[PDB]
Amino acid sequence: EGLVEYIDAEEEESILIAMQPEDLEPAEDVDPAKRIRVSATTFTHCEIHPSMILGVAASIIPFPDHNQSPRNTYQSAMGKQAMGVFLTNYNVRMDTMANILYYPQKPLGTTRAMEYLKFRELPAGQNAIVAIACYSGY
Amino acid sequence: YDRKVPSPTGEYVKEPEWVLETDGVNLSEVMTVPGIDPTRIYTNSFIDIMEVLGIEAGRAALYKEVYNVIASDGSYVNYRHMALLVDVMTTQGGLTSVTRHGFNRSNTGALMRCSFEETVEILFEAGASAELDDCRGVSENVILGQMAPIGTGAFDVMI
Amino acid sequence: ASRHGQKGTIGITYRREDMPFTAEGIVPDLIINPHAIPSRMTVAHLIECLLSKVAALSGNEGDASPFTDITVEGISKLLREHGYQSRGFEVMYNGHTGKKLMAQIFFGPTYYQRLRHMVDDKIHARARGPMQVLTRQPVEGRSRDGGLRFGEMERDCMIAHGAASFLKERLMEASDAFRVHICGICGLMTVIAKLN
Amino acid sequence: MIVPVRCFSCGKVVGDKWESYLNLLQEDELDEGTALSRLGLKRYCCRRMILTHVDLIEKFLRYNP
Amino acid sequence: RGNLMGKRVDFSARTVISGDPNLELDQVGVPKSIAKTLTYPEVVTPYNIDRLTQLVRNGPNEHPGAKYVIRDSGDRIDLRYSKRAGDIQLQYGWKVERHIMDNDPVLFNRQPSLHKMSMMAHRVKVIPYSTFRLNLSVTSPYNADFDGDEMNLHVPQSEETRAELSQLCAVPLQIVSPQSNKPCMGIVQDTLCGIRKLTLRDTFIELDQVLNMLYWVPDWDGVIPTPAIIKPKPLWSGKQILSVAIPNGIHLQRFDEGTTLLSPKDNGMLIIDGQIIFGVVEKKTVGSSNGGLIHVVTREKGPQVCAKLFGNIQKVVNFWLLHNGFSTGIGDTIADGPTMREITETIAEAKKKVLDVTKEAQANLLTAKHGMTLRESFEDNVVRFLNEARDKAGRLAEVNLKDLNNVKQMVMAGSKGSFINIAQMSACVGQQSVEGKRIAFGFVDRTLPHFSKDDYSPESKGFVENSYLRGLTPQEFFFHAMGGREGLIDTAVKTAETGYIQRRLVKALEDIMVHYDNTTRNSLGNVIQFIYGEDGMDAAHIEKQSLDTIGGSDAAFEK
Amino acid sequence: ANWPLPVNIRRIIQNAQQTFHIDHTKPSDLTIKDIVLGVKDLQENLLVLRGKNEIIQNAQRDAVTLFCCLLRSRLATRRVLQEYRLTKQAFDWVLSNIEAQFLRSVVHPGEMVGVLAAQSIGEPATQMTLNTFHFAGVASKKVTSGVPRLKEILNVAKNMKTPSLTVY
Amino acid sequence: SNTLFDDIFQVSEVDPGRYNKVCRIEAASTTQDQCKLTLDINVELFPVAAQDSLTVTIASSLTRSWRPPQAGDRSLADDYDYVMYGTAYKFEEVSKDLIAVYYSFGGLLMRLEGNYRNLNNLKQENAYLLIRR
Amino acid sequence: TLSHLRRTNTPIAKPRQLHNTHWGLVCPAETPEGQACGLVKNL
Amino acid sequence: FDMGGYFIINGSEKVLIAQERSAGNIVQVFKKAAPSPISHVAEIRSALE
Amino acid sequence: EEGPQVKIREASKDNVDFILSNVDLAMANSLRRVMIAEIPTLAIDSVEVETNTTVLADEFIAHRLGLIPLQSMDIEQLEYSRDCFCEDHCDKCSVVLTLQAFGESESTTNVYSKDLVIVSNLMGRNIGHPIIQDKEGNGVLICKLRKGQELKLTCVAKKGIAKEHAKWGPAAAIEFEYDPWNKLKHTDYWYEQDSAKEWPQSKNCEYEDPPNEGDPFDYKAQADTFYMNVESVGSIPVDQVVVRGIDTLQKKVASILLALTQM
Amino acid sequence: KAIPKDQRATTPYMTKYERARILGTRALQISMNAPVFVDLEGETDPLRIAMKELAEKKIPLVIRRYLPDGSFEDWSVEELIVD
Amino acid sequence: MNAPDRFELFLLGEGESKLKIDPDTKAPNAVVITFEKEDHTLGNLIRAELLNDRKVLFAAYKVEHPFFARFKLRIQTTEGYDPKDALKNACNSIINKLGALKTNFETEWNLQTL
């Protein structure tokens, strides 16, 4: 219905895009604690939602924007070493080595992108109580 | 450029001087030109300082250049080391390369020259030029599995 | 590790007693040093942990999504209203003594993952045993109870101390100790030693 | 993977409540913030034991032998 | 290269390593199950049959036990097997391969071994739990974490080989660096971040704790020290009881920029005879520093004396910290409201002064500077303009941090992180760069398809006006990403180039040893240096001594 | 002025004035013979090389040289009797100790400095990357100006990246 | 082993400089013009506002380990409340004569000027500090 | 499993870079650390 | 939950990893430094679909 | 009374909130640390699987059983497996149970702790009763069976204490506090603008006086008066929890006085 | 070849390498029931006892320090300054 | 595989006394007592009740290594008056207050409903 186009990188060259599909069109008092955005009125097509640049393991990251990117990367390589419930069918698959976490739990903060990644339903960890403290020195 | 200078009164006071920065190298003739101090002229190229001002200026250029890589932003290595490195590169005559080319030739024991970067051809010529191996290096006695004339084996022990 | 590249291994396990605790009696599952924070820049870890608290008390599942209008100062207003102070903290009492910790601790739920690699899969010990045929050197891998390789770079360090006899041992009585018969003239390995 | 007996942090029994939790969420229709409370779960460590739990045995049970 | 100069070796162990502040510097936390397996041949002298017969009886399971006994005839005796494992007469001259007991010489390294330091002789304390355990202050010269870093351990077979480790390679002897003439091991983390808290003039402790902290240092003379206060309450000072660790005959003098023998702000350092006079103790003093305490105590009788100290400092500091506690919150990157305004206008002016220098290059003239030509150019100009806009905001967010800001503590102590660390966390992350130049144009005449072609402004070439506490924007996010990648790139590749630079340097000097006439030669007898380092002096023993004959006035010379 | 020099003097000074502490205001007991004829004699038995022929004893002085200018400047009469106020016993000590200190700062015949002349050299570089990173921007100079410029200096580089000439 | 000095002093400035317990006190001397004082007083144990008048005895008596009390009831105050223990270090100079002393009560310092000098002040190791009213 | 099925390996001017024309096709932070870093990306 | 896409071979699962290549049939301009004989080169990888 | 002055304000079948006046801090702490760990209970500690066709593997279910709350009131007159004189287990040291269920129904057959059957002679004391707090009467979901899956088992339960595993705690959650108004200044508050607007005023303010602006700081005043709440799992009713605590605390306190006399 | 009793210009101190190697070469000697010379206070470690035999210079061995040219210099442990 | 058995926290092994006494090598009239198989539930309680006695010069303890839960206690007391007795006398003070605790609790437990 002429609502979405597919665009590849070669065709990307001659286009203008908006983030934030709203941010970023309409008309021209504001929170000081909120972040700082930049802004052309000659756009071709809006991006769906920024957070879609991410892959799989990256969209498992809560507040990846609030994190130093080299860590986001470090987390990605570790997400695929995480321990959980890789399939439901394990109990009749005869693969060499498979670990299941005794008691999985969905995370507490969830990137919208987890719903399509189906994380909430097959977690790989536990919301365990964390104490950022100096103690014994161990 | 700032510079500390003997102020006849006694103290070291800061002396501002105009200095010229160049993006080209031809020492052979720059220093011969009227109006400059042909005692302080410095090109970052130590390869040319070698041919123009003799091996002993190079000894001091090479160093000063390794200094400007290492000890810039805070790093510190005690003169001994860089100077030790510098000296090795300097006594064989010209500027000895830290590669297979240079130090992996200078009439050393072949077995030791073997454990570096070219391997077979080195033995190949050893058998050809019928080399005799000194058996006095570190490598030698390692490959020969012995107590190499190193730290605790500088000496034998008798009664 | 948690969800931000925060690797650290358990250094010790203290039971619920020696562990610090809160005026409600919440005992934390997990104590990380505030030293792997700034280091290390990982400010989200802090946010996740703050959001999760809210999420757990209010019941609502928190929104951790990337480029969205969510403020710490906006979590702070919501945690404030829930009986705890706006930036995470909680007065804690040392467990050995019951004496109030003179500093306030940051405390809350943060989704932690269990990665593989566990000491009891890595621990390797060898002395003598099985060796290859091509080299009479000790075989590779803990899979066949093999030795470690004392690589070239390892040799280098020893020379720096000048462990003489050490190198002889670490390249003889712990690898190859073959004994050949050499000619006093043609000095090669052809002599027949009919013995004993 | 089946509600755990008791919570890791406190120690309070939490098993008994999974049955009742579904009923307070779906039968008489409530939000969780109320639901965990009527269930006597005040401390958040024992609160997360149920809110965060995903019950996989269900899909284990769908299997035949 | 791999089978002669790099031999696979027996008698070795490999494990995950963990931190243990209750061990001593020269120690190694060997797990029991390895201790069961790693042997050491010992001949049977009438000195040591007592301990040894016993040892055979214990067998290859009870820890103080053994595997294998070797006879006069060259016969081998397995101990887990064999039908006489439950006795055996021990003759004089028999090898009795045995488990490793406590206090034994062993080498304990970590690859990559880029030192002589990353290979140190240790003292064995057999412990349960399968982790290798080492003293928190020997952490620096191996370069090891406990995030799963894996270390290795070796075991001598001759007594002379033992002697060779424990004389030359032992951690104590390797304290002060024969490389940078300053001690490599210092007080790090929990210990160093609390040695400051302890010491603050403000901080006092009383009887109940004071009496305990004393009982924590093992070389305590049983002499309570007299409290600095005997007013309505008896108190000691944080300084007071630390001095208990500082051994008798030790002397240190500092002065910083603001140091007045008063020190209102308690700057610098003064120590007389194992007692702290005034000054906050941190990384300048108690650290892996040049003119620090560790240096002073080592060179003054001696090695082990200094090494025994490291431990006693820790044991106390830890104890105090344990009861005082410490953390870090999201409020520890929060700054004053009317100051994040002050950072936004600090950028806004630096931004709206880029727009000045920008609307010149477009003008253009320009005063196109003479060299500095250019194009070099305007694309260097704005690099500094933004690297300025950051280091002011980084400072404007350091005053904001009151004395209690859990981050500033670790910075003032230097436990981990510094200025830039705070800057990014609280103000703005700054101009991300690629190969030292701001984000390169990938797309034709633009950076991304969110910008219009030809946008040389900061907001387009990779400047992030936001902080981590505000969370980067998508446009920005990618750019910071772009860079981050670049650091990891060389963690796999530019690392080669370097480690190759070394492998050469190593092979090129190698046998350059100071001979018995103080002349520095090679394998042939070529002279290289005539006196090592042109003064015949070992670097370890050398200190940064000021030559006060050079500075000053002619009049300041005469009188 | 601030340079690496063997054996701290400034220390054995403070180690003097609290071991016999004098200290006030209460005067010395060494003649200007004990001070000046002593230093020159210590200067004699300091040693780095030992021998009996002329060439050795000459390179000998030509190694001590610098260290002495330091010794000579802090063991100078005015100061030895004004700022530090030593005594016959505590000076004799300072002397016997600086000597005893010195000949412990010899390089041991055996030391392998070639390898040490490594690493060292080839050390920080590796971990001054291979840190590597940390973490973001900018970041170096060091590792990019740089560590490639060092690959030049050791290959004997003719194809020189940045040739630069500085005239005074 | 007897009482040492004693004088009457007046508070000129109380600066709560980046601390909460332990403040800096700047006092001038009563009667005697040729004297100034800077001292470190734990304000969380003994309050001092501006223009307060005080009393300041020194002393050096009232191996041996340090005992608690056992009251008995040795000695030494009721009328001296704020008591501290410390060490002497370096001795100044300015006129000739005069002349000042340096005191470290376990990190909390004291500078005192003026010529009496004394010499009923010792170079030495002891040093108490007593303050009343 | 998800992140493995969608993997992208490259054989062999500047290659392991995260380059501007990766926006929204490759993941700017997903990639193995060391060994073959920056070559093998994820969609 | 298994979304498939792997080839089952010898009783193990196998995945095809996208192989990357430079796109053919595009005109690309290369330099190319020139000590060295030449200074500029036009290149096109030409193959049929 | 002579010393410690305990006062209750709220008490229930599962919660015991109370003041604790005029005692040294060290005790208050020594008290909870016993209550957490050192007090004995009973729980499963030897399972023997005969048939299990559940989707839950064998040592999983096994693990779970240990945790399940077991009535322990008369536990004082029961002997430890270690301290007894029989082989493995008996009826003067161990209480055995038995679990049986088999999928018969086509619609999800549950198993509960009700389904636990005592098997060994009880001697006639109150001990080893699966504790139900459940509204409906089915205490804590153990496991799920489908259509034709069996679970046959044989639990043995021994006496134990929290230091040997967390199952042996009647603990639950111990609330602890003193000096809600920072009178003793044992802690120093992290603040941004102002202490009192940014921290909360505790549950423990009523019946403790505010300090009043101009009043100078009291140096020598010590920690008196603690505000505690002690939850029970249900194995030992709330009153006996705190009691035995004191007791065992005193029990092994006595053990030193006895051992010192043996010197 | 060889150097005579006089003309000694080598370092008259024990190099740590001579230390460890002498302590060591005595170690194996002690450990293989060979006669021990000094009064054994109560110790039994071939490595501690030898540290005592070096305190009172009673080790009959002699170093032989080789010079680059080939000729050697003697020196006994009884003759050496241990430091 | 290396983990110590859980019961090695109260089971006293063979040839192991619950108390060891050794006098302090340095100060006179003082003792270091080795409390085996115990934590600082006993460690803290004994110590902060050796303080209320004015006849004790010194009183303190340390958890040597959280690996082996066994502490040491150092006691110095006024000349003549033996330390072993100090510990003895102090112990009873605890018991008595504890003995009261049982009663006073029970008093006020009885009166309450639910």
Add this chain to the structure above:
RNA sequence: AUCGAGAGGA
């Protein structure tokens, strides 16, 4: 066991 491929850990 050998040669060959890949994935991960610092």
